[PDB]
Write a protein that binds this ligand. Structure first.
Ligand code: HEM
Ligand code: HEM
Ligand code: HEM
Ligand code: HEM
Length: 107
């Protein structure tokens, strides 16, 4: 099976780059993020051609990169979607985990 990469991984398709640490989300099963495509968990980079390669942040299609990281109501929880459930009614955790600025994702 594939191995989780080191922490400090750069997501930098955009001008608002974010650091991703596998270790802090080890409680999540790999395939919740590296989700099935054509019946097989896919471990390619999220913005691989044909995947989430549409860099218009308004796009809501299966190619929308921003959509895949930020939106609710998605087939697999997005970064923000899952973090919202974790934070619950805790406003401090909401700021840390879902805030658009001054959060753990965006400074
Ligand atoms: C679980 C044990 C698990 C594995 C295994 C795994 C692997 C993995 C690889 C091999 C990469 C590198 C991809 C590349 O070719 O560059 C990678 C990258 C990302 N991962 Fe992961 N990963 C596992 C678990 C999880 C979990 C639980 C999530 C989500 C909560 C997650 C997310 C990500 C993200 C985001 C990346 C960056 C990919 C990008 O295109 O920027 N992983 N992982
Ligand atoms: C990379 C770690 C990665 C993330 C993050 C990610 C997220 C994601 C979400 C949140 C959805 C649901 C969107 C919705 O509106 O329901 C979603 C859906 C699809 N994705 Fe994805 N995805 C990541 C990686 C990849 C890779 C490597 C590809 C391409 C090989 C890919 C493709 C797709 C497709 C197609 C869907 C829809 C699947 C379905 O509806 O069954 N994703 N992704
Ligand atoms: C999606 C690509 C995604 C990002 C980006 C992301 C980031 C992130 C950060 C920055 C933290 C804080 C800890 C750290 O610095 O590493 C953090 C923490 C938690 N996450 Fe996350 N995360 C992304 C995705 C997801 C998904 C899809 C889930 C759940 C299905 C998830 C969960 C969690 C949990 C739980 C934590 C810890 C909460 C805390 O209070 O520390 N993440 N993530
Ligand atoms: C808060 C709701 C919030 C906003 C708004 C926001 C915006 C935003 C922008 C403008 C981008 C760049 C899009 C582009 O293509 O120009 C971007 C990128 C990423 N984001 Fe974000 N963001 C908000 C919140 C959060 C939170 C809380 C996380 C993490 C849990 C997060 C994550 C990401 C990720 C991942 C990216 C892509 C990074 C890259 O590849 O460069 N955002 N965001």
């Amino acid at each position: 099976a594939p191995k989780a990469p080191a922490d400090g991984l750069k997501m930098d398709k955009t001008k608002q780059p974010v650091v991703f640490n596998h270790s802090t989300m080890k409680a999540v099963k790999c395939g919740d993020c590296h989700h099935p495509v054509n019946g097989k968990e896919d471990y390619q980079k999220c913005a691989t051609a044909g995947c989430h390669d549409n860099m218009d942040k308004k796009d809501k299609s299966a190619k929308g990169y921003y959509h895949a990281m930020h939106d609710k109501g998605t087939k697999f929880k997005s970064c923000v979607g899952c973090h919202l459930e974790t934070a619950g009614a805790d406003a401090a955790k909401k700021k840390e985990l879902t805030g658009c600025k001054g959060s753990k994702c965006h400074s």
